[model samples]
Target: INTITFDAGNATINKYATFMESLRNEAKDPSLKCYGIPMLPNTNSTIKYLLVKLQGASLKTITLMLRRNNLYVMGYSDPYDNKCRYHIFNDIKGTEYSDVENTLCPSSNPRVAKPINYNGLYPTLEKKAGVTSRNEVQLGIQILSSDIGKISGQGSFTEKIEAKFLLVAIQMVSEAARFKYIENQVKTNFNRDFSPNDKVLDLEENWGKISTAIHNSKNGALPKPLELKNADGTKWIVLRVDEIKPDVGLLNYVNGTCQAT
Candidate 1:
């Protein structure tokens, strides 16, 4: 995606830093209302993706996981001390052939998202904000392990290391979800049945059945669409994720075995 591009001549800029900064800028860019090649309900050779990222929505700890079919990107904003702010972006909404919106993190008003397909593709948890109480962070990791099947990344707070690590984590999962959604779309278009190289759409479904409300006008937002030409005159960027180990540094809780405190 052009928005996530890095400068080849500027070795001074780290790729991770460049990427994160790009996402931040995209989310807050006002000119990008919504843009992408619009699709029909029975479209072919297509895939859809939706993204949710945090901006100044500060939190001491954040917990992200898939609650069966819903996405819980929950966290704690320390000033609230004992409470947490969160959002629950579900996987399904509307009907198979209705005009109801099936997009995720939809705005309360009607001006924001317009899902093109009945099955819902490229649904975003539009920029929203709110506060709630429920210590999150850990149980999400537990779900990541038990349900989604992983979470090898671990670290302690150290400068902006944790923030970078978290950004990479979000990007990583966004990439993963994109892959899963593509696979789902392929299966749907083919009719009969096809097996994914792995489990396919059977992911985390058996776990169990699966928000809050606030205008995140000042706190959070989605990646702004790039000014590239398309069927819609502009287009929202998509992640063509590449694996690169970030420089998140080592854990920062220990002073060393310098013996004696």
Candidate 2:
């Protein structure tokens, strides 16, 4: 939790100015690797950071949301026009996972990839980049508020917005196929148990079935360990399946060991 304050005796205004400049500087990249996405100001990257005036009466809303830590942050890519859009992030992996080395973008290697659309609420389609045609050219990284300080001992201001970036240059060695398999099973088995009109009931019943299978190993079957590659074409393997949750859509975590051979 970073805090920013504005007050007298501390040159808060200049500090604020420096912070803003830092943000701009951070946003600038020549090799086009900001947040793992190859984005340029005009070409592939449209808006680097979704800038919001951190001041004014609207501060109430911002501050309230901030207090609740309810800010959504995530990444988006426009593969067709080679653009990356920075939007709110949510869990929308679609309960699917795989360990297969599949094409990140079915069209062009650097085309637009899928967006993480939570509950189908956010817009997952791009006008210039059609939904499925684009590749996952970039990864948008955002840090909401890292550093905060006081201004004039009365008002508050943020000192640093540390937005970090990863090359995302490495291609996924292995896709998350196993996870996807489990997800499909849920859908298939669930549908067989319930009619289309009773999707709500199916959700509840199917969630339980998957959950039981995952835990008991009797109701569900686990995927075998698999190896994956990196953007540099390096290979790695899954050490073990730590846990699996077939409910609430789908979720799981794994422990893996990677060797760059």
Candidate 3:
């Protein structure tokens, strides 16, 4: 009988190769989406929590500071019918959350007479008892236009009242607006190329292509190739490559530029 032993060295190398192949295949059909809101330890989330507390009324025991983080939904209610709904908090503390547009409120809160545009993050707090225009941006469908009017009652409720205050502040940074805002931010970040000028490379475009391309010439290297100086005044090292040379460290360095810058 012949005994076969497992070789750990070869097995590890084969496993690594399989993983890389799978990653490359996945990258071919990348599912890209804008992510709004910050995760743990983000300073902005703490600030957001504080902002809500300062601006809110019924925010009982609300503390945005996170040894860890707390994510929750805010609900808007109708005093008459008791009809209400919850909306997602798109930001950590204060930032754009998403690209998906939500229903807009007719005017920003308090100064409802001003007639400003508001996006969703806050749901309607009241149903019209009797009114025309079934579907209006600031009313039934969108901002619940006469919201401030209903929140205040006939004339007694003040703008500084607690019941209306919390809804107003939260609706400011909603899922709909956040989605759209973050998408733009991500696009802006991705488009920035780390060249001398922050101009993105349009590899497809050529003002007027010549019979012979400049890059195809015999002399490829410049007199002194462009160099980057280290922050601590350390020397710079430039690399030259004829074929595809894979370096994990170089990949990591460039990956950050592609994602963040």
* Highest TM-score against the true fold, candidate: 3
Identify the superior model by lDDT, candidate 2 or candidate 3: 2
Best by lDDT: 2
The TM-scores, one per candidate, come to 0.18, 0.19, 0.20
RMSD (Cα, Å) of model 1: 24.0
Between candidates 2 and 3, the one scoring higher on TM-score is 3
Error of 3 at 27 (Å): 31
Each candidate: RMSD:
24.0, 22.8, 22.3
Which lDDT tens digits does candidate 3 get at residues 1-261? 111121111223343233323322222212211111111222223222211111112221121111111112322222222211112232412222211011111122221121112322223221221212111212111121223333422324442232233332222222111122222222233323111111111110110111012122123222233232332335434332111111110111011111110
> Candidate 2's residue-wise lDDT over 1-261, tens digit each?
222221111323344344333332333333322112211133234332322213222121111101011112223222233422122224423322110011122232433233333321112322222333113222211111111112111232221111111111011000111123222332343212211122222332233333223333322233343343322345534332233332122211111211101
When sorted by lDDT, best at the front, the candidate numbers are: 2, 1, 3
lDDT of candidates 1 onward, in order: 0.23, 0.24, 0.21
Whole-model alpha-carbon lDDT for candidate 2: 0.24
Error of 2 at 257 (Å): 26
Error (Å) of candidate 1 at residue 112 is 38
